[PDB]
Design a protein around this nucleic acid. Structure first.
Ligand code: MG
Ligand code: MG
Ligand code: MG
Ligand code: MG
Ligand code: MG
Ligand code: MG
Ligand code: MG
Ligand code: MG
Ligand code: MG
Ligand code: MG
Ligand code: MG
Ligand code: MG
Ligand code: MG
Ligand code: MG
Ligand code: MG
Ligand code: MG
Ligand code: MG
Ligand code: MG
Ligand code: MG
Ligand code: MG
Ligand code: MG
Ligand code: MG
Ligand code: MG
Ligand code: MG
Ligand code: MG
Ligand code: MG
Ligand code: MG
Ligand code: MG
Ligand code: MG
Ligand code: MG
Ligand code: MG
Lengths: 117, 200, 144, 63
RNA sequence: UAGUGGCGAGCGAACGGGGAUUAGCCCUUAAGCUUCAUUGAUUUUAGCGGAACGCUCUGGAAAGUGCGGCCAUAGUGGGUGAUAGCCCCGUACGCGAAAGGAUCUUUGAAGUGAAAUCGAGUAGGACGGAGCACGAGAAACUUUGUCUGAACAUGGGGGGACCAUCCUCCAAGGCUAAAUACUACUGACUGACCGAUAGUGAACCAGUACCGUGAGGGAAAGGCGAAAAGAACCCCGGAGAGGGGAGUGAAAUAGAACCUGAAACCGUAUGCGUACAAGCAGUGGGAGCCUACUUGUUAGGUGACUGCGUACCUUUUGUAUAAUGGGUCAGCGACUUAUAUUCAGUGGCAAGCUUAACCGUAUAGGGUAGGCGUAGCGAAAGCGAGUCUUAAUAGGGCGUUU
RNA sequence: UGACUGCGAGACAGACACGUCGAGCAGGUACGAAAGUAGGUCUUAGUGAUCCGGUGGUUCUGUAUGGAAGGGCCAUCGCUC
């Protein structure tokens, strides 16, 4: 009939505080402060799954720009050339070539330069 | 239909009673109604009105900086009233007479279909000795058994009183819960006929 | 069949609403009561017939009629109910024995509703033209 | 305890098979200035409007 | 429901019916009741007896494991070193009172009922109140503060204004059990009641401490261990407090503020980071370092640097808002319950369905008084698959083909 | 004397309560030779729910019965509410 909340409530609070591990001050010790931090960190994490894809693409495009300008092309002209010559290598792989396989990246840039003119 | 008797030959019983379909939702309602009918319902708590003291306002409504309080027996307070304090109430549901009989018919038909009904020509013990009843039920190979007789014998009642998993009931005393709980339902031929008159 | 193997049919029994038990329940923090106003308050109920202070319908309209005290001892017995009487004679006391009229009923009238199964005698009981024809068609008769 | 019917509502709304009957307003005491057509068409009973049934059904303790 | 009601909010019968109980006696003096004898029955206030188990394993300890028995009108009781029908106390069952109380009874005695002798300042009336469901209403009836005031069974009262007829009763004198109400108190039994912030305010030396002139208000506070076996003795220390050994114990981080021993909060140790750096303190990316193995597409800890990023609740058109609330933790804290009812779902039965009180060796079965349905229309008399309106069988309203 | 009596298919309007228009049928009229027209006024303001009480009718009811009272129904009166 009478239901004590102590055991269930302790399990709830401990799950939140375990998620607040590593947080500063009351954000890792105090439940009603840690609860807000765990929710906000979750809001950030959801939003940063989207932002990670943007951040990495901006990083690939910048490295492709640097790599292609070493080969006499800007990023915009290289992408247009990679569409004129039907090359579907994506920017993640292109940015890996521009750093790690520079001879392979030079061959692709020359293939884009030839396609443009 | 035909109900086999351990001693004598098979007898003919009513299809309505011993061969109907199993209405599980109706049997469930009768079992739930029967268990609700056995509750004492005897408890209470105290509301804010019934807890000792608490007539005076603990402090003035404005100025002290505290949250406003009307009584120290507010259910918000430690030692105060129970918000919705229980009072002794009855838990018995109403079961229609025919609803009860239909559940009994379902239980009896299902007991026959599950081989959990044992029919014997008669069941009497001579002396009120538990050892005698144990010997009788061991010949029939029964350990957890409800014994249903047309008239509960005085010696039979005494002999089964201390037995661990044995219950002796009159036909009128065979509730839906005991017909389902016990592993077997040993029933005399007289009680089978008395069942037929009641439920058919 | 077992005590731990018994269910009611799907939809026979349901959980009750439990308001104010968190966000996920769908009834948290107001209990479906909205935000403010009388209807949200504890004990907040609008009286039956209350129209906001406008003249209520139960007072715009006039009182009419009177109740009939003479009609409190009367009952109507259908022709389909005459066959359920015992003893082939339909009377005031015989209709009470059959539980077709109440004990306080002092005058009975029969009207055509259903078929008179068997020939019966109506003793001290009035009938309509259609009921009288149907009763006499089945072989019945009337006595003062 | 058992519900108490509003006395005033029961005196103005008769329950028949088909709804609740009631008389009409505006037939009480200022009748010379009213046309015969208006007074004749305001005479008799009428069934309760759809929007007023639930409210009156609650005033009477039929719901 | 009838009725009542600023006919508002509300209040709210009776007749009739079903039940529980049942009882009637007198004023030409009784049924009863009380008291004191008295004859027998029980009952209560102490008690008595009360069955039947061993070996084995783990274990501090056996009641638990395994094997094999026995008692049961006694098997889900409480304990005993962990969970016992057979170890103890009990339990079913059967016995028991020197003495006192009580209840039924059989007789007897007075006492009372007892008002004496059939009802006069009474019935009726006027005024003003009260009660009758009835608030003056067309207001009967009861009752009486003021004032009046009959008749004598050939009479009188009532039947809801009032009158006549009819029916029914006999007021102004009394006594009367049962069915009904309650529980401060005593006992037993029980609980889909609580289990120390709960449950009584009060598990504890609680109506106490304490507060108040006073009436009055009114707490907090349970647990070592199976058993004190409650730590002999030695050492530091003030012949302290508190400790370190020793010992006891199954266990002492069970050491008396003693079961478990959470969180806030406060420390010590180690690892990494941190003194050119601007903000809800995270999140995405990410080097280095440390640790451990799986020896680098690994796990854990830290996290330089960097993108993005103004808590939560409430209330609002709108809140980072410099609007509200919260110092934190732990515990408690808010849609319940009863009775009537409507709709839905899911069952039983079906032109029928269902009982209430109540009875009932009692969740059964009986009880069908009642409620709803099978017919409507009409304010109603009434008529009736029709009815109402109307001069109208015409139109129209509602109803009828389930 | 149609500023008629019973109604009324069908609409407009509209939260409700109210409101507006109305062919046609019946009864009984007026005017016109007749077809016809007339259920007020060229139209749109001139109004007030319920309760309560009053007045005229009424085949309804009538607390044992017959009456009556009282109630219902139809008509109508009393609010610068
Ligand atoms: Mg309490
Ligand atoms: Mg029953
Ligand atoms: Mg929502
Ligand atoms: Mg709010
Ligand atoms: Mg608002
Ligand atoms: Mg609102
Ligand atoms: Mg009946
Ligand atoms: Mg009128
Ligand atoms: Mg013993
Ligand atoms: Mg232990
Ligand atoms: Mg007398
Ligand atoms: Mg008098
Ligand atoms: Mg009198
Ligand atoms: Mg009378
Ligand atoms: Mg007398
Ligand atoms: Mg307490
Ligand atoms: Mg505790
Ligand atoms: Mg030792
Ligand atoms: Mg312990
Ligand atoms: Mg401890
Ligand atoms: Mg630095
Ligand atoms: Mg700073
Ligand atoms: Mg990362
Ligand atoms: Mg930023
Ligand atoms: Mg504002
Ligand atoms: Mg904003
Ligand atoms: Mg703020
Ligand atoms: Mg600020
Ligand atoms: Mg604050
Ligand atoms: Mg009369
Ligand atoms: Mg009249």
């Amino acid at each position: 009939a009478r239901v004590k909340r102590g055991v269930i409530a302790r399990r709830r609070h401990k799950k939140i505080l375990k998620l607040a591990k590593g947080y500063y001050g009351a954000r890792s010790r105090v439940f009603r402060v840690a609860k807000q931090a765990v929710i906000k960190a979750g809001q950030y994490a959801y939003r940063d799954r989207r932002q990670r894809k943007r951040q990495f693409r901006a990083l690939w495009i910048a490295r492709i720009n640097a790599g292609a300008r070493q080969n006499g092309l800007s990023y915009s002209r290289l992408i247009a050339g990679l569409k004129k010559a039907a090359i579907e290598i994506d920017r993640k792989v292109l940015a890996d070539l521009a750093v790690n396989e520079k001879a392979a990246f030079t061959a692709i840039v020359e293939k884009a330069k030839a396609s443009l003119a | 239909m035909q109900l086999n008797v351990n001693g004598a030959q098979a007898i003919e019983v009513s299809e309505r009673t011993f061969g109907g379909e199993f209405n599980e939702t109706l049997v469930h309602q009768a079992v739930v109604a029967y268990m609700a009918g056995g509750r004492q319902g005897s408890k209470a708590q105290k509301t804010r009105s019934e807890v000792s003291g608490g007539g005076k306002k603990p402090w003035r409504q404005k100025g002290t900086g505290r949250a406003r309080a009307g009584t120290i027996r507010s259910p918000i307070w430690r030692g105060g009233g129970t918000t919705f304090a229980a009072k002794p109430r009855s838990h018995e549901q109403k079961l229609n007479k025919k609803m009860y009989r239909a559940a009994l018919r379902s239980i009896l038909a299902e007991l026959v279909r599950l081989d959990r009904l044992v029919v014997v020509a008669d069941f009497a013990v001579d002396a009120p000795k538990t050892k005698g009843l144990v010997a009788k039920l061991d010949t029939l190979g029964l350990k957890d058994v409800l014994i249903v007789t047309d008239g509960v014998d005085e010696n039979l009642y005494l002999a089964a009183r201390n037995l661990a998993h044995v219950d002796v009931r009159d036909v009128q005393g065979s509730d839906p819960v005991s017909l389902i709980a016990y592993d077997k339902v040993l029933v005399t031929v007289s009680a089978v006929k008395k069942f037929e008159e009641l439920l058919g | 069949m077992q005590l731990n193997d018994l269910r009611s049919a799907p939809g026979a029994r349901r959980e009750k609403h439990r308001p104010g038990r968190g966000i996920g329940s769908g009834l948290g923090k107001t209990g479906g009561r909205g935000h403010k106003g009388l209807t949200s308050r504890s004990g907040g109920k609008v009286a039956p017939g209350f129209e906001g202070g406008q003249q209520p319908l139960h007072r715009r309209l006039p009182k009419f009629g009177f109740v009939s005290l003479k009609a409190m001892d009367r009952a109507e017995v259908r022709t389909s109910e005459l066959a359920k009487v015992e003893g082939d004679v339909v009377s005031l006391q015989t209709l009470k024995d059959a539980n077709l009229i109440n004990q306080h009923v002092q005058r009975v009238k029969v009207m055509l509703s259903g078929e008179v199964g068997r020939a019966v005698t109506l003793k001290g009981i009035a009938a309509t033209k259609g009921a009288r024809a149907a009763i006499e068609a089945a072989g019945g008769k009337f006595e003062d | 305890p058992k519900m108490k019917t509003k006395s005033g509502a029961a005196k103005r709304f008769k329950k028949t098979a088909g709804g609740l009957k009631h008389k009409h307003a505006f037939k009480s005491h200022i009748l010379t200035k009213m046309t015969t057509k208006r007074k004749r068409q305001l005479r008799g009973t009428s069934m309760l409007n759809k929007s007023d049934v639930a409210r009156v059904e609650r005033s009477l303790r039929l719901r």
